Amino acid sequence: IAKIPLDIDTSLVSDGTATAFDPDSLVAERFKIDRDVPVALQQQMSVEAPSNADVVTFQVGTTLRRTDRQQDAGLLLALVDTVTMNRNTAEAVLPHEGLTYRFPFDTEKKTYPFFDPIAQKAFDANYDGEEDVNGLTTYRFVQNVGYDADGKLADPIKYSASVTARAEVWGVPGEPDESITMDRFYAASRTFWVDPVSGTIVKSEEHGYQYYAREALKPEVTYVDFKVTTNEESVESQVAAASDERDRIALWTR
Template identity: 30%
Template structure:
């Protein structure tokens, strides 16, 4: 009985400590953007781009790729640096890859380097960013953990500034409950091409896992116009089904891990630990109430000569 009491007390202390750690220390550790991000997002849709030589503006199938990688060596415990390669290409039926700048099927392409806070997901000015990196503001490639139903500043690379993206409603995507956010810009002055002024319209929509802040689906409906009103670009794309499934599966797995670490472990630790401590204490108290117990145990253990 004495051994059992000590085991219960020791195990109870262990569980309580684990529960306290899960409540106080774990959230600040697990609710951070990881440093091993390496994702490829594939979009499909249709687009039309003006041909300067002929004036043709035919709408054709298109795909877009966003390849995002974290630079773990340049990142830190507080910030994570990302390198994102993006392109939009007319789909001629071949492999979906970013083509070079001489390819007539290329619509747009760019490389973006930025840093975000690992907790808030907001853009930051990090000392390890290259000197020519474009300053960012707002959210870029994910939302913070525990997303709220409110507006967030969201980076628009074409405008070069953040735009408020508003919560719209709750929507189920592949069995995952998500928050849908969107923003609209219209008649915004931009450079339609290098040295060519014009205007820009766009409707951006993203579906976000509210637990982890990961974007599982997104799309845009973008138009660009020359200064005289001639439409130069019309592109509508949305995340393809395979990318959505992968993102949803990852969000579900990460959400389950958070539930285990931040909910189940604290409950089991604190409640189970308390029960073990109470049971161990009762066994010791019961033993003290039996003054002859130790003598009896020693008598039973005595071996005859």
């Protein structure tokens, strides 16, 4: 019925709060962890080569920054991702699988595989109900990565990463000047609000958690624990884009 357009160029922002390690304390006497820090997650998406009649490539740059700092300070996380997807299905075709940044046209009330770029694997995005978003009826989907159905930490992803520091520097118990090596782990939970016609994700809520531990289910030191939601302006921009796409599709479909 339709193809993902080749002229997508969006910059979306999600605001929220985090507990975060201060990267500027890496060589300090004690690793500094700041609580209840305001943050902004910015996602910039642009179309790149290869894109043609069949496929579309998106380059996505994502940053998480503290908003109680000026522009040269407070960068917490940065990720660049590149994916080529089928223009008709939105499915991925470094190797990605399933949905990544959009749902298919005529999205159904069912489970979809949705890629997590840190886990480097697709996890179920389960249908969770209908909800109005700025006058548009959307389908809500929920994806858990490392958390079970009850929201308990169960299978966090171990990064392939490790950090070695004295117990006094980590701020954990230990023998005097004991050297401790901890692995980095990741777990996340996301909610997507989807326009069922165009498949556009008009709003998202994301709760990301990265920490250091000797054992996966016994987190010891937080790297980042953030919860963000797409801001009003970004939701309005996506609802407008989805609405334009829907108006165009309505002209040649039944």
